[PDB]
Each structure stands twice: as C-alpha cells, then as structure tokens.
Design a protein around this nucleic acid. Sequence first.
RNA 1: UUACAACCUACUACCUCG
DNA 2: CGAGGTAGTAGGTTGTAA
Length: 759
Amino acid sequence: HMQLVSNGFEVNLPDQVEVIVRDLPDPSKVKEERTRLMGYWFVHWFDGKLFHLRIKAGGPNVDGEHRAIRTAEHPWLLRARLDDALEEALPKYAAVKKRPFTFLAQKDELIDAAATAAGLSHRLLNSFKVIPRFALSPKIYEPVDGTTRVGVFVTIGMRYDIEASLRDLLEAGIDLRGMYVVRRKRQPGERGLLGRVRAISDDMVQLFEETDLASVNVNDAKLEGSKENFTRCLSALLGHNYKKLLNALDDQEAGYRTGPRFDDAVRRMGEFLAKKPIRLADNINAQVGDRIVFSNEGQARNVRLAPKVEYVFDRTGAKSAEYAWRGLSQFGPFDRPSFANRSPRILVVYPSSTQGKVENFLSAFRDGMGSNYSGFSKGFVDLMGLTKVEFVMCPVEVSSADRNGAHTKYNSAIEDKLAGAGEVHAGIVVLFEDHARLPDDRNPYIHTKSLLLTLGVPTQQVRMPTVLLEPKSLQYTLQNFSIATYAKLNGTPWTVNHDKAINDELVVGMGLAELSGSRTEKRQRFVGITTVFAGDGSYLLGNVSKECEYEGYSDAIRESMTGILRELKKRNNWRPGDTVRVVFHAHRPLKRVDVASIVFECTREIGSDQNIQMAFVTVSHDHPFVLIDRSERGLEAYKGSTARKGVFAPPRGAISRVGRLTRLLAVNSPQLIKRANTPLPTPLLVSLHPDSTFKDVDYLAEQALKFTSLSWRSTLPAATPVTIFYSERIAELLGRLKSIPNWSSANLNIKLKWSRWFL
RNA sequence: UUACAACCUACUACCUCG
DNA sequence: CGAGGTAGTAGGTTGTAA
Ligand SMILES: [Mg+2]
C-alpha cells in the first residue's frame, strides 16, 4: 500500500549520553548494584559490562571509566531507560506490568457501561470488571538500512477480572464446582493458580487439581478472569438477560478495538506523552515525535503490496483462481487427472441412535445439498471428479451418558466390522459432544484415530452438533470436511503459485505441541516436521514426520534436510552450477549453533558442484506492531449495511519493513474480517536469522503468505504457514497417540505416506 | 473433534550475551 | 547460571464461512 500508519511514535533522543562503565563478568551482582544505586543512577548490564547513567545529583558514587555512548550506535541503552521513564512520565497510572509499562484506564469500566446500555442490573455485577489496558513498548527499528531509531509502540487490550468474594458467589447460588481459582495477591515469583473448587465449607475453599496446598482461605483466593468463569457466573446471575450483556459488551470493546477507534486512541496516547518532554535524567530529555509510518518517501523503501496468491489447479497454470472454493468448484482438484482411487470405500462409525442424522449428513456430503445451498450444491463425488463413494456403515451401541466405556465400544465395533469387510480407504467417525473432551485414556476421538491410523486408514471425525448444523452453516462445513477428506485419501486439492527462479527449493517447518491431562500437571513437549518443495510453477507438499520426541529436535531438522536434499539431487539431477535454496520456518528462532551445524551438514551433503542458499525464519503472532491503512473504508458487514467491517485494515499481502532482518505481513484483509465489531487485525512479524546465507526477507514474507493459502483444512487461509501449522497438528496428534494402548506409527510412512492424515 | 476468526485467562519458556 | 529482550502454548466462549 502507499502509506501504512503504525501504532508507534518517534522518540527524539539526545544524540549521546555520558555514562560510567565497569567490567562485571558475573551478572548476578547486578541486582545488588541496581538497588544500592536506586534513584541516583540508571544501570544496565550488556556484554559483560555494567553501564551507569546518572539520573540525578548526589548519592553513592560509582567507579569505572567515563564513556560517551552515541545513541545512533547503541540504541539499547536509552531503549531500556525509556521503559522506566515512560512509567515515570505517567505517575497517576500504576504499572500492572513493567517492560513494557502496562497500565489500566483510570475510569473506563465496560461491564458497567454495557449493563447501562443494555438496561441491566444485578447487585454483584459491579464486582465483574473489564478495564482497558494499554502498554507502551519502546522498540528499535530502522527506517532506512543502517540507520536506527527508537519508537514507542502503543497496544490496547482488556483486563477481565472477577473481584467478587467466593462466599458471595456461592451465596447468590452459582455453582463454583470445578472453577479455577487464583491468589488475590501474588508475591515475587509466587504462583497465581491454586487449583479448582471442590467445596466451600467454613471460611475455606477445598481444592482439587491443587498446585501446592489442598485448601486456601476464601479471602486469599478469587476466580480467574477467564471467559469460562465470566459466562458461568453471569449466565447464572442474569439468566436470559445474559445475552443482552454479552452483545452490549461486544459493542463496548469495538469502541476501543476497530481501526478508526484504535487509531484515535493511539493518537490520544501520543498527544498525552508529547505534551511534556519525557525526562531520561536530571538534565536530559526525550520527546515523543510524529507517528511512524511505513512509506517509500525520501529514499526510504519501507512498504510493498505482494501480488494476490493464486490458487492453482493444474500442473501448468491455465487454471488459477483468487479463492480456493471458487477455483475448486470450477476446475476440480489439482491432481484430478492422476488421482488413483475413483471409488473410495469409507467406513462410517457412529452411535446407533444417530443413524437418521448421520444418513442425512452423509447424503449432503456425498451427493450435495442441491441448488438452494450454492456453497455446496454438487457433493463430494462431483466436486472431486470421483466415480462414486461406498459407505460401510458401522453403528456403535453407545450412549452419550457413558463416560467410561465409550472408547471401548467404538473400537470393538470397528474391529468387528473391518474383520468381515474388505479394504477401507478412510473413515468418518461421528462423536457425541459429551465424549469429545473426555480424558485420553477414555476418549473415543483419540482411540478411534489411533486404531484406524495403526491400520493405515485416515479418519475425518465430526461431532454431533456439527452433523446437526442448520443448512446455511452446513454448506461451509461440508466444503472444509470435503477438502480434508480428499487430502486424507492422498489427493492434492490445490497448490499455490510460485515463480520459477532457482533450480529447486525446499521449505521445512517445525511445530510444537505441549500436552498434559490437566492444567496442574507439567506439559510435555512434542514436535512435528512438514516439508514443501517448489514444483513447476507451484508449491507441493512433501512428506511429514512420524517421530515426535522433542529431545534432539535440531538433529531431526538436520536429518530431514540432509535426507531430502540427497533424494532431491538424485531425482532432479542437478547440474554443476545450479542453486538450491533451503528455508526453515518456526514460531521461534533457532540457536546460532544449530544453524551452524544444519548449514554445515546441508552444504557437505549437496557437495561442491552446486551453490546452496539457506534461510532460517521466525514467524511471530504476538508482538507490539499494528498497521493501519487510513485509505481503507472497509466493507459493508453484510448486504445493505451502514455498518462497516475491516475499516482501516491493510490489504492482504502488505509487507512493511521494520529493520534489515524484519518485516510485517498483513494477512487479514477486510474481505477476511468476520464482522463489524472484529478488531483491527494485527500483522505477522517475519524475522530472518542473522546467520542465514539467503538474505531476502521480502521474498521470505511473501512465501510465508503463500503458505497460509496452502492449508487443506479449510477453504479459508490458515493463521500461520502450513510448514508450522501442519507440524503443530502432527505434534499434538502423535504426542497424544504415544500414550494410547495398541497405537503404532508403523503405517504412517507406508499406507499413509501420501495421506494428509493430520488435517 | 468441519473450520476460520476474535478475545481472555493461565502457564511459563525461548533466544542472545557473559 | 543470570541479565536482558522477547513472546510462546493451552484451553475456554462467541460469531461467521474471502
Ligand atoms: Mg481435521
């Protein structure tokens, strides 16, 4: 876009500050000196050295060497001092966090405002609070390459908090049983979470899944400020008015979170922070400047709009579209000419009592909903170019009220049905809502997923509330169910475009899952790996991981890359002088040492005959940056609407430069924004590891964008590139399956090698 | 567990450097 | 093993399907 406005302001800083520097090779002394010199000096440890900035005349003295520190060369000093000085600039706002300074609005409280707007009241409602929370993050950025500056970035959220005495909630007739409670006050490094409520007898809450002690005094504990606890309290207290409160609260928040309202709030924060000089030290001021923009003015080259992603439906490119569903329904799937299994046999496993409902869903899915539900008129068979689909019906004698034996019944019925039947190529498993979230030792989702994956049969499962959706929602659910089921059968629904530049490119991602059976039990880490290859004008999904242990994960990345390089070379028969590029994706940066051994081992495997280029990229969701497109009017929220959605939301594929290694990428355009009250979106942050030998982060941001469009879980694009997302879905599944009796990964790389079984 | 999206809370980690 | 900058991951509730 021409000009993208950020949520940050320039901070005009002195061009240098004098400081006193002392060697301190042991960081553990810092906390003793910081305290010792409180109020008189700001101190900061960097690079084995203690840096001391005099904030005011007279107090303990410091020894060391005098140095002048030039802000252009070492912005880290004054960046850290700003964290404290912003706090000091706002003495009437109490820090609820430091670094970044985070604080509450003085008066605004939205429960009260929503209650008033809805016409509601209840004696305990003043004890439920939703309060705007602002943070001010000083960040280093580079308008133009080689030149640094510090800006202050403004972000807004809401603190949800339930102040109510547990005694008063019990006495007003809310059932506290099972609610998570936290300490009212926390000490330094003390935990918040205490456990769940078993009972309140006497002056004390009895807890289970406790973290430390098994009981705690009513007055030391509060319900955690979760949506679960708000809904459970307020629905009980307000009954059939609860809906009115909710819709009105949604309106209040929109007043802080939509584009023009966010923009206006950042404006007002800036004007407040600007009104005075912000003082860094006794005789040293900083000054909050203009809003930071991302533009191509005056030899800055800080923004671009990537072209639209093309959804690709053949090996050439004749058949492309801007949207997955419109492409698919028009051309059929990318692999239609070669797809091997025109007559899939699909086992359908379901509670016997849901038979008529399951038959209706199956008819809709297979044969279509017809021409009044135009999102899913024609059905899976014609959609995908198949000859037919045979269902093998597997009813299970199981009740929704059965909490302990549901998994056993599903599995027995599967075994018994399969033993007679011939080959089945996939299954659909239909699940009761009350079974969906049972613990894994008795969960029918995971037990049936396990048994059928062991047998080499991918499944697409579904809950009964989904089976029963009204037809206008059901059409969109059948789109997504269809896309994943076809992919489960080895199909390639679509690919995404790329330009033929170098002689081969491999992208590998890694994803984490952190699993436990409850919130009070320590999570265990598992990983997945997903690979994607450049093909002939479009990107192709490779093989995925079958092992999921987190320990050794850098070696597993290295092993995946070196094995695939070796096989890519044999296949493509690279010529002397060809260039091969390897890109890695994750939600965190790799270690420098691991980058070194990966590069070493990939370079040794490829050999001296080819050039290799390697990039290591972090994709970040939660950071302090927001992009505002003031040109964007937004769209009508539905047909004929004075309300707008995605007002000020940058276009999808907008790429802004933060610094040499970092870009912001806008993914959620007005079209994709859900409703009028949906907030201004945040972009993803794309960061290139400094040790990368391939350096074009613009190219890597556009590539990440394309990979969000490659998901076969949905017609709509994913939140993060499939290299990472598929890996998280694999890690979660494989880490759960680890503990399920009789699970074996043996078929994962045999019957299921081309099955997208993890979608 | 059709999904996409938003939010909230809780939990802690990750990388760097010495 | 700690300073320092940073933000990841899980699970719940509600609205909507480029
Ligand atoms: Mg799925």
